[PDB]
Amino acid sequence: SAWRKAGISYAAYLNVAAQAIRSSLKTELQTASVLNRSQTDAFYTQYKNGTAASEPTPI
Amino acid sequence: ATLKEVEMRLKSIKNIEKITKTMKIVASTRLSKAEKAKISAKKMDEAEQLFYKNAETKNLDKELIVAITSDKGLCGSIHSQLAKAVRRHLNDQPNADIVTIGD
Amino acid sequence: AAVVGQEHYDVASKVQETLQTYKSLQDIIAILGMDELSEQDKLTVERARKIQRFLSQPFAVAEVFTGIPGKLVRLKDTVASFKAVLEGKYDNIPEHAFYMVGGIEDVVAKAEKLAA
Amino acid sequence: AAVVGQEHYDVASKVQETLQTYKSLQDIIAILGMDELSEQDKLTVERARKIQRFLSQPFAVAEVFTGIPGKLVRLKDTVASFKAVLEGKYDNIPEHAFYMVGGIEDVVAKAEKLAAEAN
Amino acid sequence: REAYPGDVFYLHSRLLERAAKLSEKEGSGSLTALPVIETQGGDVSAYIPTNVISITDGQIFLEAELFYKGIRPAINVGLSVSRVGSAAQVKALKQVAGSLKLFLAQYREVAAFAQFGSDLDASTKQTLVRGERLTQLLKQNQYSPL
Amino acid sequence: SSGLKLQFALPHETLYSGSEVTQVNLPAKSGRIGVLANHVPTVEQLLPGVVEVMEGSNSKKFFISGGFATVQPDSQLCVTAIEAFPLESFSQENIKNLLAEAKKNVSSSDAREAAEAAIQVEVLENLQSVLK
């Protein structure tokens, strides 16, 4: 309930709502477009001030 | 400059002409795909920037700069144009943080 | 096929087709790079450079040239080794651990040796 | 280097390196364009195409073709001029101002002429 | 040219024209000629193949590049023609193969598209399925006529 | 003017764009608000609920996954949200409950997973009103 305090930001809050509505999709009409909407493959690497690196994490 | 060298280079450049023609067609198909996403971004962004037009939210007085380019290359004069715009805006605030999206 | 057996003939066919598709894809990659291919295409290119450098071999006469003792490989190991690398059982191994190697046993040994 | 001086030899070697880099990169420029280079080599190609148009020289005998009087540029000014363009002192000058010129002083002057004209 | 003699065309034109198709007045005998020209390095600009192509009725033009794809016998249908063609075929195979020429002539226009992603419509991927599988049909092992 | 200009917008396809409309009903943080022809300029964050659009024609009922309702001062109401919904087809209890118990099980895990799990619990229990 305190997702603003403990969990996600508000855009991420509605994103989890989007994955929930897309997860409770009708399996007849859960098309490939909606599964394209849930295909997260972006990677993020937090560089440092000395151009250092972390490992690429699947967001 | 033999016959064999010229024939080999002619065969390689006929392959390059055919492959670039196919790449132009496939990029045109993805462009006709992505016009839909461009319109769905813009017709939705109007419904929230129209508020910012009427609610005039003009800011005054440590900055974040975020650029959106590609992971791939081969699109021509984009990868250095937007870098140059970053350079113009970035000489003004050299201490500003930057989060790039795109390799 | 009716002389060397259907296994050997089909392995020869798949090696020959893989090397041909590599030779044809060498027109694309020399300008467009690897980034334009499919997944099965990048798999085929990697497998093809695997099977290409797998044909390298040291020679007992040419030991003065490479400083490497001569690996002489029999046929029945060779057919099954190409059967493995065509089926993709050693896709995880990088390219350079196939160069100037005899059979698949020395393949795996050099793959472990070059980890350090 | 022991005949014309070490500086002269080094300048000539750098100029032939830049122009050889241009002649090697000729084909990719012909196919795709200048935009698909690196960012060291794109500067190399641009400085190469500066130096090519800078290699021109209005002759005292071909005065009726170009309409420009003759230019007899001595050796040492040419050595210093190419050393200056190699060291990057002039990389933002437009390319056409290098064309059909005497020394680097006339490059600055002609770039100033085209600056006063284009404005 | 290429140190061949002068009348070497008159050699081959005296040979290949001995095959024919006699009339019903003579008895309807028939000789049918299949010569073979070993060309060099993928060429039809050499002197003997130019002469024989100017004599005969087309090519079953065979290539190494189509052979290493495994297409056996490697018959380049984009070049192999026959000016007699649909006059002297079995009517049964004629009444179904008449579109097959059209499908393969379509497929060789497009088959560079088959080495990319899934970014095509069904109007091209249909012809690609047809082209890959029909080209795959023309494989057969040696010494197995049908 | 009489009536209202409605502009319903989604990241994949905007459904309504400048359509004249009579009544809209939409879930805000202060409760379920209906907006009619003129209105106070008002920005309402949209909790995931149901939006009903009544026109000269009937009222179409949508489930909506949240967003923003914004009343432009010329009485032009825009809704900027994520998900559309048919009459009743897109939701089924077999996919709801069997995943919902697993989501309540994820709600006892570590914090980042459990928070999103509790969010999905709340969204499915809101979908219980669509089960109706």
Side-chain angles (χ1 to χ4, degrees), chain A residues 2-4 6-7 9-20 27-34 36-38 41-47 50 52-53 56 58, chain B, chain C, chain D, chain E, chain F:
Chain A
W3 54 269
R4 180 69 190 273
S9 64
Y10 177 70
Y13 177 75
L14 298 183
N15 196 2
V16 173
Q19 290 183 359
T27 183
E28 180 180 0
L29 292 177
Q30 186 179 0
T31 181
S33 175
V34 179
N36 284 320
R37 198 177 303 171
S38 178
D41 289 332
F43 291 161
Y44 62 98
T45 301
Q46 184 179 2
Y47 284 175
Chain B
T2 70
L3 192 143
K4 185 61 69 179
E5 293 170 352
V6 174
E7 184 181 1
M8 183 269 292
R9 192 171 184 179
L10 190 70
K11 184 255 288 182
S12 69
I13 293 170
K14 283 192 282 185
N15 276 323
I16 287 175
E17 184 183 2
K18 177 61 181 172
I19 290 301
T20 55
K21 178 61 69 176
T22 59
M23 187 60 70
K24 186 181 77 69
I25 294 172
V26 173
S28 179
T29 299
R30 283 184 184 175
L31 189 64
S32 67
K33 188 260 189 295
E35 281 288 329
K36 262 62 184 299
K38 184 177 183 292
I39 294 300
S40 293
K42 188 175 285 186
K43 296 292 182 69
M44 183 175 70
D45 184 73
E46 286 183 353
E48 186 173 358
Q49 285 288 319
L50 187 58
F51 170 71
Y52 285 157
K53 293 287 103 176
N54 282 317
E56 299 177 355
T57 56
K58 276 77 177 176
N59 51 1
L60 288 177
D61 292 331
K62 187 177 74 172
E63 188 177 1
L64 182 60
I65 300 166
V66 171
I68 304 296
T69 70
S70 66
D71 290 330
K72 297 179 179 180
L74 294 171
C75 70
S77 65
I78 302 298
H79 309 286
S80 294
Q81 189 69 40
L82 187 54
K84 197 257 180 63
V86 170
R87 188 67 60 86
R88 290 190 187 94
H89 183 79
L90 192 64
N91 284 318
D92 292 333
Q93 293 84 16
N95 47 4
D97 289 332
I98 291 167
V99 175
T100 63
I101 299 179
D103 196 1
Chain C
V3 176
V4 302
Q6 188 64 43
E7 181 184 3
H8 186 271
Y9 184 76
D10 292 331
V11 168
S13 296
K14 286 189 284 186
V15 169
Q16 204 168 6
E17 290 178 353
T18 299
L19 292 167
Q20 177 56 44
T21 54
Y22 182 75
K23 188 175 182 179
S24 290
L25 285 180
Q26 283 294 315
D27 299 332
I28 290 170
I29 309 167
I31 294 299
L32 293 173
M34 190 64 72
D35 295 331
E36 300 295 328
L37 287 180
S38 174
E39 290 295 325
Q40 189 176 3
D41 292 334
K42 289 189 285 185
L43 178 60
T44 304
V45 170
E46 289 175 354
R47 285 179 182 176
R49 291 177 71 197
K50 288 182 189 295
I51 296 170
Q52 172 178 355
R53 289 184 183 89
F54 186 72
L55 293 174
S56 64
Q57 184 173 357
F59 276 159
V61 174
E63 187 178 1
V64 299
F65 290 97
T66 64
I68 296 170
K71 298 292 183 182
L72 190 148
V73 183
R74 297 293 306 275
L75 177 64
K76 301 291 180 65
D77 177 72
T78 310
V79 182
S81 296
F82 280 103
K83 185 64 177 292
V85 183
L86 283 167
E87 287 182 351
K89 292 181 183 293
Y90 300 100
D91 294 333
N92 50 4
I93 300 171
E95 299 174 353
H96 188 74
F98 289 173
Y99 173 72
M100 199 74 80
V101 184
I104 194 65
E105 301 173 354
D106 297 333
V107 163
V108 178
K110 192 173 184 179
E112 293 180 356
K113 183 70 174 177
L114 295 176
Chain D
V3 178
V4 305
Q6 181 59 254
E7 182 180 3
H8 191 283
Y9 181 80
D10 290 328
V11 168
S13 295
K14 292 176 185 180
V15 169
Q16 285 186 355
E17 282 179 353
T18 307
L19 289 170
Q20 183 63 41
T21 307
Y22 184 75
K23 200 272 296 291
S24 66
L25 292 180
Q26 180 67 257
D27 296 329
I28 306 169
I29 299 300
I31 291 298
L32 298 175
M34 291 180 69
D35 295 331
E36 299 295 326
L37 303 176
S38 73
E39 291 297 322
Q40 182 61 41
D41 294 334
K42 187 171 182 178
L43 184 63
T44 305
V45 171
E46 287 181 353
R47 190 179 293 173
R49 290 182 67 188
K50 289 180 173 67
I51 292 172
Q52 274 193 354
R53 270 79 168 180
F54 181 71
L55 288 179
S56 55
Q57 179 179 358
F59 277 164
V61 188
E63 188 173 0
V64 299
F65 294 91
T66 65
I68 301 171
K71 302 297 289 182
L72 183 66
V73 178
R74 303 290 293 168
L75 189 146
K76 297 177 176 64
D77 183 77
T78 313
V79 177
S81 301
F82 280 96
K83 186 176 180 70
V85 182
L86 284 163
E87 287 184 354
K89 293 182 182 180
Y90 299 97
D91 297 335
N92 55 0
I93 295 180
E95 178 176 357
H96 187 274
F98 286 97
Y99 171 70
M100 196 61 73
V101 79
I104 191 64
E105 298 177 355
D106 294 332
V107 174
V108 175
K110 186 171 180 178
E112 184 177 0
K113 293 290 185 182
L114 297 176
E117 289 180 352
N119 291 318
Chain E
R1 180 177 173 181
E2 286 187 354
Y4 287 93
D7 58 351
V8 71
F9 189 83
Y10 177 66
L11 183 63
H12 286 169
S13 65
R14 192 176 61 195
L15 180 68
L16 294 172
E17 293 297 316
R18 295 182 68 179
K21 173 64 170 65
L22 298 179
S23 70
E24 288 172 348
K25 186 172 89 274
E26 190 65 33
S28 298
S30 65
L31 185 67
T32 297
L34 295 174
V36 167
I37 300 302
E38 180 183 1
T39 60
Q40 300 299 111
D43 184 79
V44 300
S45 175
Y47 184 65
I48 308 296
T50 302
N51 288 322
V52 180
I53 288 167
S54 179
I55 296 175
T56 59
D57 289 339
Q59 298 83 17
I60 300 170
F61 187 84
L62 308 184
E63 291 176 353
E65 177 186 359
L66 291 174
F67 187 78
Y68 295 119
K69 289 184 178 69
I71 302 166
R72 297 178 180 180
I75 302 164
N76 192 2
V77 191
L79 299 177
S80 293
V81 300
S82 176
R83 303 178 183 90
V84 175
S86 295
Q89 198 176 9
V90 179
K91 291 180 181 179
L93 187 55
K94 177 179 169 64
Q95 293 174 1
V96 292
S99 65
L100 183 60
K101 184 75 172 177
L102 184 61
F103 279 104
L104 291 176
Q106 285 176 355
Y107 172 64
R108 287 183 298 270
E109 298 172 354
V110 190
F113 284 175
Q115 295 174 356
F116 291 103
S118 177
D119 303 335
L120 291 174
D121 56 353
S123 175
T124 60
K125 192 182 287 182
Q126 172 64 39
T127 310
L128 258 63
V129 167
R130 294 285 178 84
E132 289 180 353
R133 288 164 174 84
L134 282 170
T135 307
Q136 188 66 38
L137 282 180
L138 301 180
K139 289 187 183 180
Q140 57 185 353
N141 288 323
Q142 195 170 355
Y143 311 113
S144 296
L146 296 175
Chain F
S1 70
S2 66
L4 189 144
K5 297 187 292 293
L6 177 56
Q7 183 170 359
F8 189 82
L10 303 177
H12 66 90
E13 178 66 29
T14 64
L15 298 179
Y16 291 162
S17 298
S19 178
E20 296 181 356
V21 75
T22 63
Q23 185 177 1
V24 291
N25 294 318
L26 48 95
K29 179 68 179 295
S30 68
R32 187 170 181 178
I33 309 300
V35 176
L36 293 171
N38 287 319
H39 202 273
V40 165
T42 297
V43 171
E44 294 177 355
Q45 61 182 359
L46 296 181
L47 297 174
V50 288
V51 167
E52 192 175 3
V53 176
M54 186 177 284
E55 300 178 356
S57 294
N58 54 1
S59 69
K60 298 177 176 64
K61 183 174 172 66
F62 294 157
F63 184 77
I64 187 166
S65 63
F68 272 95
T70 307
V71 183
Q72 299 306 115
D74 50 359
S75 295
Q76 179 172 2
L77 180 136
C78 297
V79 175
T80 305
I82 297 171
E83 295 293 326
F85 182 71
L87 298 179
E88 284 177 352
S89 66
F90 189 74
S91 65
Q92 288 181 355
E93 294 189 357
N94 293 320
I95 312 298
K96 284 181 178 180
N97 290 317
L98 298 176
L99 295 179
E101 287 186 352
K103 262 55 182 297
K104 293 184 288 293
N105 295 320
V106 174
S107 70
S108 297
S109 296
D110 294 334
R112 302 293 299 168
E113 297 176 354
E116 296 177 354
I119 292 164
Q120 287 175 352
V121 167
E122 295 175 356
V123 173
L124 289 168
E125 291 174 353
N126 288 314
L127 282 170
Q128 292 173 355
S129 65
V130 189
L131 299 176
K132 192 256 187 66

